[PDB]
C-alpha cells in the first residue's frame, strides 16, 4: 500500500507514535517519506547482505528474520515479510523498540540527513488529526 501523507499520519497517531520518546508526529511522517516514499512494500538490499523492509525500512541484521542474513538478530521477533503489510502495526511496534535503543531517530539515516533539524511540522500541515 502507498499511503497518502495525511492518511499515514492518522494511522501513526492511532498507533501511538505522536511524541513517542519525545519525537513529534512530523518526524515519523518525514522519516517514512524519505525511507520508502510511503510504500509499505519497499525493500532495499545493503552491501552487507542485510535488507531494509517496509515503510520505515527496518533492517534484517538486527530487527527481523528474513532467513538470509547470517549473523543476525531478530529483536522484533517477527518475519521481515510482516513489515511489508498494508497494516502498519508490526512496523510501528518494531520502530518503538528501535527508537528506544539509545540513538533515537538517528537509527534511520534518511531521518538524520533529511528530517533532523528541518520544520517537520510541515509534514502534518493540513491534516485532520
Curated annotation (Swiss-Prot):
EC top class, as a word: hydrolase
Annotated PROSITE patterns: GLYCOSYL_HYDROL_F22_1, GLYCOSYL_HYDROL_F22_2
Gene Ontology biological-process entries: cell wall macromolecule catabolic process; defense response to bacterium; defense response to Gram-negative bacterium; defense response to Gram-positive bacterium; killing of cells of another organism
Localization in the cell: Secreted
InterPro entries: Glyco_hydro_22, Glyco_hydro_22_CS, Glyco_hydro_22_lys, Lysozyme-like_dom_sf
Disulfide bonds: 6-127, 30-115, 64-80, 76-94
An example Gene Ontology CC term for this record: cytoplasm
Catalytic residues identified in the record: 35, 52
Binding site for substrate: 101
Catalytic activity: Hydrolysis of (1->4)-beta-linkages between N-acetylmuramic acid and N-acetyl-D-glucosamine residues in a peptidoglycan and between N-acetyl-D-glucosamine residues in chitodextrins
GO molecular function annotations of the record: beta-N-acetylglucosaminidase activity; identical protein binding; lysozyme activity
Annotated EC: 3.2.1.17
Highest taxon of the lineage: Eukaryota
Pfam families: Lys
Tissues with expression: In the egg white and polymorphonuclear leukocytes.
Residue ranges of every copy of the C-type lysozyme domain listed in the record: 1-129
Keywords: Allergen, Antimicrobial, Bacteriolytic enzyme, Disulfide bond, Glycosidase, Hydrolase, Secreted, Signal
Family statement drawn from the similarity comment of this UniProt entry: Belongs to the glycosyl hydrolase 22 family.
Subunit structure and binding partners: Monomer.
Note: Lysozyme C is capable of both hydrolysis and transglycosylation; it also shows a slight esterase activity. It acts rapidly on both peptide-substituted and unsubstituted peptidoglycan, and slowly on chitin oligosaccharides.
Its biological purpose: Lysozymes have primarily a bacteriolytic function; those in tissues and body fluids are associated with the monocyte-macrophage system and enhance the activity of immunoagents. Has bacteriolytic activity against M.luteus.
Protein name: Lysozyme C
Gene: LYZ
Amino acid at each position: 500500500k502507498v499511503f497518502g501523507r495525511c492518511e499515514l499520519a492518522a494511522a501513526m497517531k492511532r498507533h501511538g507514535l505522536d511524541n513517542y520518546r519525545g519525537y513529534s508526529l512530523g518526524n515519523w511522517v518525514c522519516a517514512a517519506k524519505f525511507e520508502s516514499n510511503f510504500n509499505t512494500q519497499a525493500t532495499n538490499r545493503n552491501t552487507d547482505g542485510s535488507t531494509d523492509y517496509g515503510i520505515l525500512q527496518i533492517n534484517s541484521r538486527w530487527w527481523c528474520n528474513d532467513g538470509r542474513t547470517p549473523g543476525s538478530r531478530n529483536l522484533c521477533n517477527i518475519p521481515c515479510s510482516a513489515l511489508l503489510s498494508s497494516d502498519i502495526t508490526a512496523s510501528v511496534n518494531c520502530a518503538k523498540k528501535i527508537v528506544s535503543d539509545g540513538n533515537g531517530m538517528n537509527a534511520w539515516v534518511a531521518w538524520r540527513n533529511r528530517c533532523k533539524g528541518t520544520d517537520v511540522q510541515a509534514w502534518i500541515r493540513g491534516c485532520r488529526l
